[PDB]
Amino acid sequence: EVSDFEILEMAVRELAIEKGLFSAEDHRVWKDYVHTLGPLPAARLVAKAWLDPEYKKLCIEDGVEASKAVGVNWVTSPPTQFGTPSDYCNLRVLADSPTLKHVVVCTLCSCYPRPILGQSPEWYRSPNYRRRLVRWPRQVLAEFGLQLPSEVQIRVADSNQKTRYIVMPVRPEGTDGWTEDQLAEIVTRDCLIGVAVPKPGITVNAKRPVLKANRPV
């Protein structure tokens, strides 16, 4: 049976179109755009940075400009021609180093770099993750299976305004001579969020429970 949510979704959408707030085409166009989103472009940006010091500097200073190199123009790629309404146009790339490791969260909600990374994980939106990460990052990351030297600076980035972040982790050992494709393959969504680090041989996010939807896409 249809849920109260599905009933209301149809009601809202039909009314909006009926009143000319947005067109049926607009809705299809947006869903199509969302369908093309994913973590691949962000992974390529990291791989490219690892292989090009000049490009890495660009990523760190001007994320928006750097993003164009992986086919994601924050201003013109979305259907609006002025960036997505919710993700805005100010991507910043956080570069990890032997003395610094970043992890991102949006304590106020779920702000995520959608244009270049795709949709946010269910857990990323949880009150739990939003409450704890900023205060107990060492403990939260450990839960994810990630631990760093005590002297290393763990920096939590709270995306609370118009900036969105992606993490550029340090290139892992054991990837000598690897091609861009090989390097991008190990930069998973979780690595770009900061709850995991790239590892040779690991090409998918760590397996975790999956809650099934009543009626999935």
């Binding site: 002025f82 003395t99 106020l108 900023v134 600076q153 763990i154 920096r155 980035a157 305004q161 118009k162």
Partner: protein
């Protein structure tokens, strides 16, 4: 009562948000490297400056862009634009219980100029 549904688009198309507000804030009150304390301004109804940062002191590491404060934008008031700063706080300055073992840990987040005052 009529709502202008073309204003934002006409203004940001081909430019982007917050790029469309560039230059509207005038001269910045602070610069990279400055030590600033977060003012505990009233939070009634809305704010995007987290309670956990109130009264804490941090270091400005970048003037990210110009834009109307969320406190105004969220209510349809975009007449005023100000500078936004990315600030880095030492975790020990936010959480009393943070361990000295992890003394280098930090938290970076953005705050509009209105919440800042020279440390």
């Amino acid at each position: 009562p009529v709502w202008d549904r073309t204003h934002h688009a006409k203004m940001a198309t081909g430019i982007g948000d917050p790029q469309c507000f560039k230059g509207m804030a005038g001269k910045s009150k602070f610069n990279v490297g400055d030590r600033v304390r977060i003012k505990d301004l009233p939070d009634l109804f809305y704010t995007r400056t987290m309670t956990y940062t109130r009264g804490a002191t941090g270091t400005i590491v970048r003037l990210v862009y110009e834009s109307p404060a969320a406190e105004d934008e969220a209510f349809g008031n975009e007449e005023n634009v100000e500078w936004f700063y990315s600030i880095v706080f030492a975790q020990k300055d936010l959480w009393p219980e943070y361990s000295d073992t992890f003394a280098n840990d930090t938290l970076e987040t953005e705050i509009p100029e209105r919440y800042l005052e020279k440390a």
